[PDB]
Symmetry: D3
Subunit: 61 residues, 6 copies
Protein backbone atom coordinates (compact mmCIF):
# COMPACT_ATOMS: atom_id res chain seq x y z
CA UNK A 1 0.00 0.00 0.00
CA UNK A 2 1.11 3.51 -0.77
CA UNK A 3 -0.51 6.16 1.49
CA UNK A 4 -0.40 9.90 0.82
CA UNK A 5 -1.31 11.99 3.79
CA UNK A 6 -2.13 15.69 3.27
CA UNK A 7 -2.14 17.61 6.52
CA UNK A 8 -1.79 21.26 7.57
CA UNK A 9 1.66 22.63 8.37
CA UNK A 10 2.57 23.10 12.08
CA UNK A 11 3.33 19.57 13.26
CA UNK A 12 6.55 18.71 15.00
CA UNK A 13 8.88 15.89 13.71
CA UNK A 14 7.85 13.70 16.71
CA UNK A 15 4.20 13.92 15.77
CA UNK A 16 4.88 13.12 12.04
CA UNK A 17 7.02 10.16 13.13
CA UNK A 18 4.33 8.89 15.58
CA UNK A 19 1.71 9.22 12.80
CA UNK A 20 3.73 7.24 10.20
CA UNK A 21 4.39 4.49 12.78
CA UNK A 22 0.83 4.23 13.87
CA UNK A 23 -0.67 4.34 10.36
CA UNK A 24 1.86 1.64 9.22
CA UNK A 25 0.88 -0.57 12.17
CA UNK A 26 -2.80 -0.13 11.28
CA UNK A 27 -2.22 -1.13 7.59
CA UNK A 28 -0.01 -4.09 8.55
CA UNK A 29 -2.66 -5.39 10.99
CA UNK A 30 -5.78 -4.81 8.98
CA UNK A 31 -4.53 -5.79 5.50
CA UNK A 32 -1.90 -8.44 6.62
CA UNK A 33 1.00 -7.00 4.61
CA UNK A 34 4.59 -6.65 5.67
CA UNK A 35 5.86 -3.31 7.07
CA UNK A 36 8.22 -2.86 4.12
CA UNK A 37 5.14 -3.04 1.75
CA UNK A 38 3.72 0.14 3.37
CA UNK A 39 4.97 3.48 2.14
CA UNK A 40 3.66 6.79 3.47
CA UNK A 41 4.22 10.16 1.73
CA UNK A 42 3.39 13.30 3.80
CA UNK A 43 2.33 16.43 1.91
CA UNK A 44 2.25 19.39 4.14
CA UNK A 45 -0.15 22.18 3.18
CA UNK A 46 0.38 25.78 3.93
CA UNK A 47 -2.54 27.51 5.68
CA UNK A 48 -3.33 29.44 2.39
CA UNK A 49 -3.26 26.07 0.48
CA UNK A 50 -6.14 24.32 2.13
CA UNK A 51 -9.78 25.50 1.98
CA UNK A 52 -13.26 24.32 3.21
CA UNK A 53 -16.32 26.14 1.89
CA UNK A 54 -14.17 28.51 -0.11
CA UNK A 55 -12.11 29.84 2.93
CA UNK A 56 -8.49 28.96 3.46
CA UNK A 57 -7.32 27.58 6.85
CA UNK A 58 -5.64 30.99 7.41
CA UNK A 59 -8.99 32.77 6.98
CA UNK A 60 -10.86 30.30 9.22
CA UNK A 61 -8.23 30.83 12.00
CA UNK B 1 -15.67 16.80 -3.46
CA UNK B 2 -11.98 17.03 -2.76
CA UNK B 3 -10.07 19.12 -5.36
CA UNK B 4 -6.28 19.18 -5.68
CA UNK B 5 -4.98 22.05 -7.70
CA UNK B 6 -1.37 21.95 -8.94
CA UNK B 7 -0.20 25.33 -10.16
CA UNK B 8 3.15 27.06 -10.71
CA UNK B 9 4.67 29.10 -7.90
CA UNK B 10 4.43 32.94 -8.14
CA UNK B 11 0.82 33.66 -7.18
CA UNK B 12 -0.05 36.12 -4.47
CA UNK B 13 -2.27 35.13 -1.45
CA UNK B 14 -5.16 37.23 -2.91
CA UNK B 15 -5.11 35.29 -6.14
CA UNK B 16 -5.02 31.86 -4.33
CA UNK B 17 -7.91 33.01 -2.12
CA UNK B 18 -9.95 34.27 -5.14
CA UNK B 19 -9.30 30.92 -6.90
CA UNK B 20 -10.46 28.76 -3.95
CA UNK B 21 -13.61 30.89 -3.59
CA UNK B 22 -14.46 30.78 -7.22
CA UNK B 23 -13.76 27.06 -7.68
CA UNK B 24 -15.87 26.29 -4.53
CA UNK B 25 -18.75 28.36 -5.92
CA UNK B 26 -18.52 26.48 -9.23
CA UNK B 27 -18.63 23.03 -7.48
CA UNK B 28 -21.49 24.09 -5.18
CA UNK B 29 -23.55 25.34 -8.16
CA UNK B 30 -22.88 22.60 -10.65
CA UNK B 31 -22.95 19.56 -8.33
CA UNK B 32 -25.50 20.95 -5.73
CA UNK B 33 -23.36 20.20 -2.66
CA UNK B 34 -22.88 22.35 0.40
CA UNK B 35 -19.80 24.63 0.66
CA UNK B 36 -18.49 22.67 3.64
CA UNK B 37 -18.47 19.48 1.41
CA UNK B 38 -15.88 21.12 -0.90
CA UNK B 39 -12.24 20.94 0.08
CA UNK B 40 -9.45 22.36 -2.06
CA UNK B 41 -5.74 21.49 -1.60
CA UNK B 42 -3.23 23.72 -3.47
CA UNK B 43 0.11 22.18 -4.45
CA UNK B 44 2.50 24.76 -5.63
CA UNK B 45 5.17 23.61 -8.09
CA UNK B 46 8.55 25.11 -8.39
CA UNK B 47 9.56 26.16 -11.92
CA UNK B 48 12.06 23.17 -12.06
CA UNK B 49 9.20 20.81 -10.91
CA UNK B 50 6.84 21.17 -13.82
CA UNK B 51 7.65 20.13 -17.41
CA UNK B 52 5.88 20.01 -20.86
CA UNK B 53 7.61 18.16 -23.68
CA UNK B 54 10.57 17.36 -21.47
CA UNK B 55 11.42 21.07 -20.59
CA UNK B 56 10.83 22.52 -17.17
CA UNK B 57 8.87 25.80 -16.78
CA UNK B 58 12.24 27.43 -15.90
CA UNK B 59 13.71 26.32 -19.24
CA UNK B 60 10.64 27.42 -21.23
CA UNK B 61 10.83 30.91 -19.60
CA UNK C 1 -3.01 24.45 -13.74
CA UNK C 2 -3.81 20.75 -13.34
CA UNK C 3 -6.89 20.00 -11.18
CA UNK C 4 -7.81 16.55 -9.79
CA UNK C 5 -11.42 16.36 -8.61
CA UNK C 6 -12.36 13.36 -6.42
CA UNK C 7 -16.15 12.80 -6.34
CA UNK C 8 -18.38 10.05 -5.09
CA UNK C 9 -19.80 7.75 -7.93
CA UNK C 10 -23.18 8.24 -9.43
CA UNK C 11 -23.29 11.79 -10.96
CA UNK C 12 -24.77 12.31 -14.38
CA UNK C 13 -22.46 13.13 -17.30
CA UNK C 14 -24.17 16.54 -17.63
CA UNK C 15 -23.26 17.55 -14.10
CA UNK C 16 -19.62 16.41 -14.59
CA UNK C 17 -19.50 18.41 -17.90
CA UNK C 18 -20.97 21.52 -16.21
CA UNK C 19 -18.46 21.20 -13.33
CA UNK C 20 -15.53 20.88 -15.73
CA UNK C 21 -16.61 24.04 -17.61
CA UNK C 22 -17.34 26.03 -14.47
CA UNK C 23 -14.11 25.02 -12.72
CA UNK C 24 -12.08 25.82 -15.83
CA UNK C 25 -13.55 29.30 -16.21
CA UNK C 26 -13.09 29.93 -12.41
CA UNK C 27 -9.34 29.10 -12.81
CA UNK C 28 -8.95 31.11 -16.07
CA UNK C 29 -10.48 34.23 -14.41
CA UNK C 30 -8.80 34.11 -10.99
CA UNK C 31 -5.38 32.86 -12.11
CA UNK C 32 -5.04 34.73 -15.42
CA UNK C 33 -4.23 31.60 -17.54
CA UNK C 34 -5.63 30.53 -20.90
CA UNK C 35 -8.25 27.75 -21.10
CA UNK C 36 -5.82 25.43 -22.91
CA UNK C 37 -3.48 25.64 -19.79
CA UNK C 38 -6.28 24.16 -17.58
CA UNK C 39 -6.65 20.38 -17.29
CA UNK C 40 -9.09 18.60 -14.99
CA UNK C 41 -8.93 14.90 -14.11
CA UNK C 42 -12.03 13.40 -12.41
CA UNK C 43 -11.62 10.46 -10.08
CA UNK C 44 -14.85 8.77 -9.00
CA UNK C 45 -14.94 7.08 -5.71
CA UNK C 46 -17.09 4.12 -4.89
CA UNK C 47 -19.08 4.47 -1.70
CA UNK C 48 -16.94 1.76 -0.14
CA UNK C 49 -13.83 3.87 -0.97
CA UNK C 50 -14.51 7.12 0.80
CA UNK C 51 -14.69 7.67 4.55
CA UNK C 52 -15.28 10.47 7.05
CA UNK C 53 -14.57 9.83 10.80
CA UNK C 54 -13.67 6.23 10.00
CA UNK C 55 -17.01 5.18 8.34
CA UNK C 56 -17.38 4.71 4.64
CA UNK C 57 -19.99 6.61 2.63
CA UNK C 58 -21.59 3.13 2.04
CA UNK C 59 -21.91 2.51 5.78
CA UNK C 60 -23.10 6.08 6.41
CA UNK C 61 -25.92 5.61 3.76
CA UNK C 62 -26.72 2.18 5.20
CA UNK C 63 -27.09 3.64 8.76
CA UNK C 64 -29.58 6.24 7.35
CA UNK D 1 -6.09 15.31 7.30
CA UNK D 2 -6.92 13.82 3.89
CA UNK D 3 -5.42 10.35 3.25
CA UNK D 4 -5.26 8.63 -0.16
CA UNK D 5 -4.57 4.90 0.10
CA UNK D 6 -3.51 3.10 -3.11
CA UNK D 7 -4.00 -0.69 -2.84
CA UNK D 8 -3.89 -3.54 -5.28
CA UNK D 9 -7.42 -4.86 -6.34
CA UNK D 10 -9.04 -7.82 -4.74
CA UNK D 11 -9.43 -7.05 -0.97
CA UNK D 12 -12.65 -7.84 0.79
CA UNK D 13 -14.93 -4.98 1.88
CA UNK D 14 -14.37 -5.99 5.53
CA UNK D 15 -10.63 -5.50 5.29
CA UNK D 16 -11.07 -2.09 3.58
CA UNK D 17 -13.58 -1.09 6.35
CA UNK D 18 -11.18 -2.24 9.11
CA UNK D 19 -8.29 -0.33 7.46
CA UNK D 20 -10.36 2.85 7.20
CA UNK D 21 -11.28 2.66 10.91
CA UNK D 22 -7.78 1.78 12.06
CA UNK D 23 -6.09 4.46 9.94
CA UNK D 24 -8.59 7.09 11.11
CA UNK D 25 -8.03 6.33 14.79
CA UNK D 26 -4.20 6.26 14.22
CA UNK D 27 -4.44 9.82 12.75
CA UNK D 28 -6.87 11.09 15.46
CA UNK D 29 -4.50 9.88 18.24
CA UNK D 30 -1.13 10.93 16.82
CA UNK D 31 -2.23 14.21 15.22
CA UNK D 32 -4.75 15.40 17.82
CA UNK D 33 -7.63 15.99 15.31
CA UNK D 34 -11.28 14.99 15.54
CA UNK D 35 -12.59 11.99 13.56
CA UNK D 36 -14.76 14.24 11.37
CA UNK D 37 -11.50 16.04 10.20
CA UNK D 38 -10.15 12.71 8.79
CA UNK D 39 -11.07 11.64 5.26
CA UNK D 40 -9.68 8.58 3.48
CA UNK D 41 -9.97 7.95 -0.27
CA UNK D 42 -9.14 4.40 -1.48
CA UNK D 43 -7.79 3.90 -4.97
CA UNK D 44 -7.62 0.30 -6.16
CA UNK D 45 -5.02 -0.63 -8.63
CA UNK D 46 -5.38 -3.36 -11.17
CA UNK D 47 -2.46 -5.75 -11.30
CA UNK D 48 -1.59 -4.40 -14.73
CA UNK D 49 -1.41 -0.87 -13.20
CA UNK D 50 1.19 -1.25 -10.50
CA UNK D 51 4.89 -1.94 -10.99
CA UNK D 52 8.05 -2.43 -8.94
CA UNK D 53 11.48 -2.46 -10.73
CA UNK D 54 9.72 -2.09 -14.07
CA UNK D 55 7.48 -5.25 -13.88
CA UNK D 56 3.79 -5.09 -13.21
CA UNK D 57 2.20 -6.96 -10.31
CA UNK D 58 0.41 -9.03 -13.05
CA UNK D 59 3.74 -10.06 -14.60
CA UNK D 60 5.29 -10.69 -11.19
CA UNK D 61 2.36 -13.08 -10.28
CA UNK D 62 2.59 -14.69 -13.73
CA UNK D 63 6.36 -15.37 -13.26
CA UNK D 64 5.56 -17.11 -9.90
CA UNK E 1 10.71 7.30 -6.46
CA UNK E 2 6.95 6.78 -6.72
CA UNK E 3 5.44 7.74 -10.12
CA UNK E 4 1.70 8.15 -10.81
CA UNK E 5 0.88 8.12 -14.53
CA UNK E 6 -2.60 9.36 -15.54
CA UNK E 7 -3.55 8.18 -19.06
CA UNK E 8 -6.72 8.18 -21.07
CA UNK E 9 -8.49 4.69 -21.25
CA UNK E 10 -8.04 2.34 -24.12
CA UNK E 11 -4.28 1.49 -24.36
CA UNK E 12 -3.19 -2.07 -24.90
CA UNK E 13 -1.53 -3.95 -22.03
CA UNK E 14 1.68 -4.19 -24.12
CA UNK E 15 1.99 -0.42 -24.40
CA UNK E 16 1.37 0.02 -20.64
CA UNK E 17 4.04 -2.69 -19.93
CA UNK E 18 6.54 -1.01 -22.29
CA UNK E 19 5.87 2.39 -20.67
CA UNK E 20 6.38 0.99 -17.17
CA UNK E 21 9.74 -0.55 -18.19
CA UNK E 22 10.92 2.52 -20.08
CA UNK E 23 9.90 4.97 -17.35
CA UNK E 24 11.56 2.81 -14.68
CA UNK E 25 14.86 2.62 -16.53
CA UNK E 26 14.70 6.42 -17.26
CA UNK E 27 14.37 7.05 -13.46
CA UNK E 28 17.07 4.47 -12.51
CA UNK E 29 19.58 6.11 -14.93
CA UNK E 30 18.90 9.79 -14.28
CA UNK E 31 18.28 9.57 -10.52
CA UNK E 32 20.84 6.90 -9.58
CA UNK E 33 18.35 4.62 -7.71
CA UNK E 34 17.89 0.87 -7.93
CA UNK E 35 14.95 -0.61 -9.91
CA UNK E 36 13.35 -1.97 -6.72
CA UNK E 37 13.12 1.70 -5.41
CA UNK E 38 10.92 2.65 -8.43
CA UNK E 39 7.15 2.15 -8.25
CA UNK E 40 4.68 3.25 -10.91
CA UNK E 41 0.90 3.48 -10.41
CA UNK E 42 -1.24 3.86 -13.57
CA UNK E 43 -4.55 5.65 -13.35
CA UNK E 44 -6.76 5.38 -16.43
CA UNK E 45 -9.12 8.14 -17.17
CA UNK E 46 -12.39 7.73 -18.94
CA UNK E 47 -12.94 10.16 -21.77
CA UNK E 48 -15.69 11.81 -19.74
CA UNK E 49 -13.14 12.35 -16.90
CA UNK E 50 -10.44 14.36 -18.57
CA UNK E 51 -10.73 17.92 -19.87
CA UNK E 52 -8.61 20.57 -21.58
CA UNK E 53 -9.96 24.18 -21.85
CA UNK E 54 -13.19 23.08 -20.19
CA UNK E 55 -14.20 20.33 -22.72
CA UNK E 56 -13.90 16.66 -21.96
CA UNK E 57 -11.89 14.32 -24.19
CA UNK E 58 -15.30 12.66 -24.97
CA UNK E 59 -16.75 15.96 -26.22
CA UNK E 60 -13.55 16.81 -28.10
CA UNK E 61 -13.72 13.39 -29.95
CA UNK E 62 -17.45 13.89 -30.55
CA UNK E 63 -16.83 17.37 -32.13
CA UNK E 64 -14.26 15.74 -34.52
CA UNK F 1 -0.24 11.72 -20.06
CA UNK F 2 0.22 13.54 -16.80
CA UNK F 3 3.00 12.06 -14.60
CA UNK F 4 3.53 12.93 -10.94
CA UNK F 5 6.88 11.93 -9.61
CA UNK F 6 7.42 11.86 -5.83
CA UNK F 7 11.09 11.66 -4.93
CA UNK F 8 13.23 12.47 -1.89
CA UNK F 9 14.77 15.92 -1.57
CA UNK F 10 18.52 16.29 -2.35
CA UNK F 11 18.64 16.22 -6.15
CA UNK F 12 20.35 18.91 -8.14
CA UNK F 13 18.51 20.90 -10.92
CA UNK F 14 20.57 19.02 -13.58
CA UNK F 15 19.38 15.67 -12.33
CA UNK F 16 15.67 16.79 -12.18
CA UNK F 17 16.02 18.18 -15.72
CA UNK F 18 17.68 14.95 -17.01
CA UNK F 19 14.87 12.91 -15.37
CA UNK F 20 12.02 14.95 -16.93
CA UNK F 21 13.69 14.69 -20.37
CA UNK F 22 14.28 11.01 -20.14
CA UNK F 23 10.83 10.14 -18.75
CA UNK F 24 9.19 12.32 -21.50
CA UNK F 25 11.20 10.50 -24.17
CA UNK F 26 10.11 7.14 -22.72
CA UNK F 27 6.37 8.14 -22.75
CA UNK F 28 6.61 9.60 -26.27
CA UNK F 29 8.25 6.40 -27.60
CA UNK F 30 6.20 3.80 -25.82
CA UNK F 31 2.73 5.42 -26.04
CA UNK F 32 3.26 7.32 -29.40
CA UNK F 33 2.09 10.72 -28.11
CA UNK F 34 3.57 14.09 -28.86
CA UNK F 35 6.05 15.68 -26.39
CA UNK F 36 3.64 18.53 -25.66
CA UNK F 37 1.02 15.89 -24.50
CA UNK F 38 3.38 14.80 -21.67
CA UNK F 39 3.37 16.80 -18.47
CA UNK F 40 5.50 15.90 -15.46
CA UNK F 41 4.94 17.31 -11.94
CA UNK F 42 7.78 16.71 -9.41
CA UNK F 43 6.83 16.55 -5.72
CA UNK F 44 9.84 16.62 -3.55
CA UNK F 45 9.53 14.94 -0.15
CA UNK F 46 11.40 15.95 2.89
CA UNK F 47 13.28 13.14 4.65
CA UNK F 48 10.67 13.25 7.55
CA UNK F 49 7.84 13.04 4.91
CA UNK F 50 8.57 9.66 3.43
CA UNK F 51 8.41 6.36 5.36
CA UNK F 52 8.86 2.58 4.66
CA UNK F 53 7.84 0.14 7.39
CA UNK F 54 6.90 2.97 9.70
CA UNK F 55 10.40 4.71 9.65
CA UNK F 56 11.01 7.97 7.91
CA UNK F 57 13.91 8.32 5.42
CA UNK F 58 15.65 10.46 8.10
CA UNK F 59 15.44 7.58 10.60
CA UNK F 60 16.62 4.97 8.07
CA UNK F 61 19.68 7.17 7.23
Amino acid sequence: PIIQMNLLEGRTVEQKRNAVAAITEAVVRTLDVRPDQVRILINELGVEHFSVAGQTAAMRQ
